[PDB]
Amino acid sequence: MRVGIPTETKNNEFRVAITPAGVAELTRRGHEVLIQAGAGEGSAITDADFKAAGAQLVGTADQVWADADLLLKVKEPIAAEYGRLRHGQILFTFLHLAASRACTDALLDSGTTSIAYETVQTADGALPLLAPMSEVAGRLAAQVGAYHLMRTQGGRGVLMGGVPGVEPADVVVIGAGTAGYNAARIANGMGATVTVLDINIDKLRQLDAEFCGRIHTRYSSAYELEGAVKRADLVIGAVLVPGAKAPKLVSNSLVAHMKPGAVLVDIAINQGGCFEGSRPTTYDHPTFAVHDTLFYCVANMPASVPKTSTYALTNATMPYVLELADHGWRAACRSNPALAKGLSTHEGALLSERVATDLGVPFTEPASVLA
Amino acid sequence: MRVGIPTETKNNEFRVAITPAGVAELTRRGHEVLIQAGAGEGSAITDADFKAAGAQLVGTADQVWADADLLLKVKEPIAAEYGRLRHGQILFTFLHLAASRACTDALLDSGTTSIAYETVQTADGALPLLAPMSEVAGRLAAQVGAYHLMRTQGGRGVLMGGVPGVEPADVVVIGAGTAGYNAARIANGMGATVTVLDINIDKLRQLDAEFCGRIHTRYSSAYELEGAVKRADLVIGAVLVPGAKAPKLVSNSLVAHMKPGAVLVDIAINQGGCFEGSRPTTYDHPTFAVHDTLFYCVANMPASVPKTSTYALTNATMPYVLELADHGWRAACRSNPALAKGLSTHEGALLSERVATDLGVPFTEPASVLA
Amino acid sequence: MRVGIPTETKNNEFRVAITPAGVAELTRRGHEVLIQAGAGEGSAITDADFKAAGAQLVGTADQVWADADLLLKVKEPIAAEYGRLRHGQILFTFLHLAASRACTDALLDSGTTSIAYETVQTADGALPLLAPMSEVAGRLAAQVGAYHLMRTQGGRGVLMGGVPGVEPADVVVIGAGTAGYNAARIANGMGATVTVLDINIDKLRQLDAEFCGRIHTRYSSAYELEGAVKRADLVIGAVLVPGAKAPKLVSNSLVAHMKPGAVLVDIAINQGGCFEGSRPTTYDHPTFAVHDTLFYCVANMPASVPKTSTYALTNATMPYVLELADHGWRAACRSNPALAKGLSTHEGALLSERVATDLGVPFTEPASVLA
Amino acid sequence: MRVGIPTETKNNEFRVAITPAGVAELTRRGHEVLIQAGAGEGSAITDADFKAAGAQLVGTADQVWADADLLLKVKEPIAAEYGRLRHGQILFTFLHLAASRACTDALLDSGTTSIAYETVQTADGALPLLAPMSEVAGRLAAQVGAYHLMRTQGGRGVLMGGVPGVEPADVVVIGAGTAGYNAARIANGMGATVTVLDINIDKLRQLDAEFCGRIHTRYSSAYELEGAVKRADLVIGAVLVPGAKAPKLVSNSLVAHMKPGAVLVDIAINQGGCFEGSRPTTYDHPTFAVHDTLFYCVANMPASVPKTSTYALTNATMPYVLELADHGWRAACRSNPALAKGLSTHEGALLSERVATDLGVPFTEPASVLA
Ligand SMILES: NC(=O)C1=CN([C@@H]2O[C@H](COP(=O)(O)OP(=O)(O)OC[C@H]3O[C@@H](n4cnc5c(N)ncnc54)[C@H](O)[C@@H]3O)[C@@H](O)[C@H]2O)C=CC1
């Protein structure tokens, strides 16, 4: 089949959905790869590098979309991409539908087959394609939090790890999953006092073991959450129920009680945000004021470190890309229950139950379109 | 005596040279404290907080300078402050004269007694007043380096500590002193691969012990330095001979061989900078391009975290402030050889030998004006 | 000469001032060793073990004191021992005179040569004979603090290191010296949140390095001390100016603001105690209430672990014992400036300056009785 | 339904089975909560705090028992509570029936529905309601062991972590589960030399990884066990087969070979004890001599740190409490196989197989009374 990779068009989205090695593996298996010129330049993969690997370098975005049977993107389609979505085409990318009705509508109306990176889930309930992006996001969250805590950035003017004799930043991380563990670890590495909350005690028990008590763990009860946030120089929001709109855990009213110049980073923004006052920002304009605090809500965080994130992503996605290309979406999903869990849309039907309940929209069973 | 503390006027300089507790201790010992209104507002010390402690809150900068017997600043005097410097007044602040002729000339022409925070040196050769600022600078260097390595900041687009399976940033720190140790430690905390160079093997042996080999140490030979730099995603410049103009260790020619998008942070900028292509920058305009790299050269780095740095600084300086105010500069310097080593100017005479050799200007013996 | 070691008679004092190996080394050098029967039974050194090594096992305490030229004790003489002190005898033991007038008076009236373990001081200002006892005391402080924080002991009923999800004990250690470093280290080992204060920034910088920021360090300003204490579940008092009465750093008024059931351990009790409400307690009756808190003030803490402390002590003291016995106090002190600094009393003369100022009693120069 | 929480009456039992937040969540779901006055005072939850949350504060224990449909306790019923057990009432608490026939008899004769915290078991075989109590018990075991090792407590008089130059305590932990891992970790934190034995090599492999070899691991063969114990200053007994009477692993005969003053802490005492010579003690009288050793056998260890343990417990139990209250025991157990595994007694029938074999008493299948 034809596998197409367009240039990413989201704000400051420098990643790409495939690397030369993946292009070379596709063409070894007798597949046709088409790639928009420049598509990899943000990740420092040239058109030449792609050409060498076996790719057909095309001049226009509209051509890739129209030709490609399997389409590989990093981010969700945006407004100007809605007109590109076809029928009988397989879209494989991050989707975050629970967070956007306007996007979900487009995939349904065009009737395209779509599977979502972020809902591919292995038997043990782990999400192996979101994982490395959560990894990148958690780590960015800490340094980005550190940076915006500088007075010069409008923030409070506390240094992350203090210096001997002078107290370090107080960091609160909500969620002990991949993103939250990774944020806590970097922030702790910067010398910050870190507290992680979660409703899953096992997650905290893991964190208690790994850092031998150096990262504080609190059960995410209303009482403990409120107290932590009221105290925090920096709050990082990192919760998730797989493929569901984030719950609202930090109210605007709570934010009014916070230290002036506190920074809040809502990693969960891509799935709705878990702060009441969050709204999607972009790398160009990353922050906005709420009360006396600074909010940071970039939905494509990994985008600023494409050398790292492009390879982190594609290391994980390729085995799944190969199976789609080799066997087609129906057979691939039939042979892989983890791939199947990612099925989002097919011919005007929404195949995720969770996303159907969050949007208030008709759900149809996945196993029903797999026979 | 009268002890005056003006508002800082350097770019984004949010620090102050005294805190309430210091004001309170001065007034217990029967001293008169005068403070420019707003002088502490950047460090979140109100005029009221200062009032409460025993300070006379004055409306203008020109009055403090004119009244104050002992004058306490954080940074060196700048152009618009040159007209404030008097005779028979003691100036106590960061000076960095080896790096500025125009500043040094002003102190000599005004005929003012000046001691420099950064050349106060104990018996073991440590600089206990520079120390905490080096601590803050080192730690800022790492996070600031992390931030500017993001593609969105023009940098290379590598994440500091990578993510599992994908290589972390390569960080090279030149100098194993206070700043460099602290830079290495935060950088290493962020998951970066860190290499520290120094011409003092002892310093590296300390670093090798503390992190049990996790921070790489290389003897700063021409060979090892050039190889480290050529390989680095981020170079942090942190060298010092006490009170002397920095040596030029990284040539512009070397920088041309570096990875495009590499960031270079010259902590040593305040003492001339140890990169050949360095020039003083500010928090407003922190970075300039040199070849295909990005340079960061802020001479007052600690300014962005006054909540941390103001207290770090004043924790250290007060015991010395008290001795100056209690006994006057001549007796204080006679009783404290560590205070003495800070003597810079008195009545048109330059009293530091090193600063005299770096500027090519007449040196006069300190012990000669102390009798 | 004759070297005598009495049984310790202080409350629960299970230590002894010599071990078999030390007895054996004394007798090799042609010295006569006399030891009160049972003197080592608390440290599990039998009369037989002592016999075997070369000691004359004597039946009574009064005989040892009367015969012995050099007398080796662990603790200071107590009331019933005051009648034992002779002229021309060298007493070598812990003294803590700055804290007891009635003890100091006894040494002056008896006219005895006395050197104090705890004021023997090397060139770098370290106290190598107090050191290991501070080590034992610091480590005891943490576990003893842990134990008395249990509700069943009257304390607050918080567990030292919490458990995942639930906050650990908040421990505040005042002083970053030997005792305080060791207290902080064990406490932190137990999972407690530890904060160390000190007026010597260097000491905190060492602590910040060693535990890589995991033990919090605060500069011991009035502001920071009061805030730490008000917050602490357990405060450990560990300050010292060599051989001087402890300064009073925690007032009774402050203690009234503390969490009910907080425990306070004043390691410094032996030198006066650094808590205002402290008074010497014993192992039998270790704790008294002050306000809604519980105080622990045992002046001979190491006594409860003689198997550890006896050898810790004697490991350190022997080289000094040998020099005393070999050359006599006058020649030994002339050849060792570190031994010299321990001189306390000789023939009715108080030879420590600091102890003279704390007691308000006539001081006489050490070097004057060494010629 | 009515959910009742009596005051705990066991020796020094300061915990409570519910906290305000849990009371508030129950009353939100339309349930009636009754709480014996004073029931929470040991955990510092006032009657007022409970009232505010929505609880009906009742004066007497007999009323709660009689009214409550779901009854929440921390510990097992004791002699004076046997007369309180009703029919058609759900008891939810720690039970430890394999260890007490007299208790098991009462639940059977009264015919009460009972589920046990300690046998609630998730699919992966983990016991999530015992877990946090094992956590608390392990950590207490180490400090309690440290304390009783002091000479003054009758113990051997070795300090846990020694001091430089002098050997630390030798600690042997039998069982690498939750309690044993937590004991080893605290003891290691105190500087003790720790050895953990287990018949499950994976458990030891986990411990070998976490502490990177610093905690010694030995396969719990007869040979290795004997040798460790013979050498130990402190032995902590921490084994378990879920809901079964502990195996006897340390014979009285072995104890005769041990160092005099050695302390043995049998955490497993609540399930019979794994030391041959153990017998239930209480916080009032915690220890008894066996041979030349000191045994410590408190069955309600977590009781002395109720601030920690009450919240540790209820954090875990509440989700299960809510399900019982919402749906009743039959439906709740039907929807939750982990809840179901806790079923102990119903209408005169013993529903645990393990407890039936240990007691030698008729077992009846759980699934049989769930239809
Ligand atoms: N902005 C960006 O560029 C990126 C955002 N993300 C987002 O980060 C979020 C976290 O992702 P992961 O860490 O992989 O998920 P995860 O499942 O690894 O972690 C989420 C954790 O939050 C906890 N949690 C759920 N509900 C909670 C509540 N009410 N209170 C407290 N804790 C709660 C869960 O127990 C879970 O462990 C996701 O929403 C993901 O979409 C991920 C990558 C990049």
Ligand SMILES: NC(=O)C1=CN([C@@H]2O[C@H](COP(=O)(O)OP(=O)(O)OC[C@H]3O[C@@H](n4cnc5c(N)ncnc54)[C@H](O)[C@@H]3O)[C@@H](O)[C@H]2O)C=CC1
């Ligand atoms: N930008 C800012 O805001 C601040 C800048 N600084 C600057 O940071 C610099 C370093 O300060 P500290 O770490 O306190 O000094 P330090 O003395 O602690 O460390 C400097 C180290 O550089 C080493 N060094 C000297 N010559 C060298 C050579 N040719 N090659 C390799 N290594 C060499 C020395 O051996 C020494 O260990 C100073 O120039 C200081 O003024 C300090 C504080 C703030």
Ligand SMILES: NC(=O)C1=CN([C@@H]2O[C@H](COP(=O)(O)OP(=O)(O)OC[C@H]3O[C@@H](n4cnc5c(N)ncnc54)[C@H](O)[C@@H]3O)[C@@H](O)[C@H]2O)C=CC1
């Ligand atoms: N109860 C017992 O059985 C024992 C008690 N001790 C006592 O422990 C105390 C501490 O001993 P070490 O740790 O060896 O002394 P050290 O000299 O190692 O440490 C004392 C520390 O307290 C600091 N300090 C002094 N004044 C201060 C102030 N105003 N505020 C804050 N910090 C201040 C010093 O800078 C020093 O670092 C001594 O009084 C000693 O006699 C020692 C052994 C046993």
Ligand SMILES: NC(=O)C1=CN([C@@H]2O[C@H](COP(=O)(O)OP(=O)(O)OC[C@H]3O[C@@H](n4cnc5c(N)ncnc54)[C@H](O)[C@@H]3O)[C@@H](O)[C@H]2O)C=CC1
């Ligand atoms: N006294 C108190 O207050 C408390 C007592 N406990 C008791 O602590 C005990 C341990 O509990 P957990 O650590 O949660 O159980 P666990 O299952 O986490 O740990 C027990 C470990 O012992 C090992 N083991 C079993 N048989 C063995 C044998 N013959 N030789 C060597 N190792 C063996 C198992 O492999 C298991 O890993 C339980 O009996 C529990 O009831 C728990 C909490 C409080």
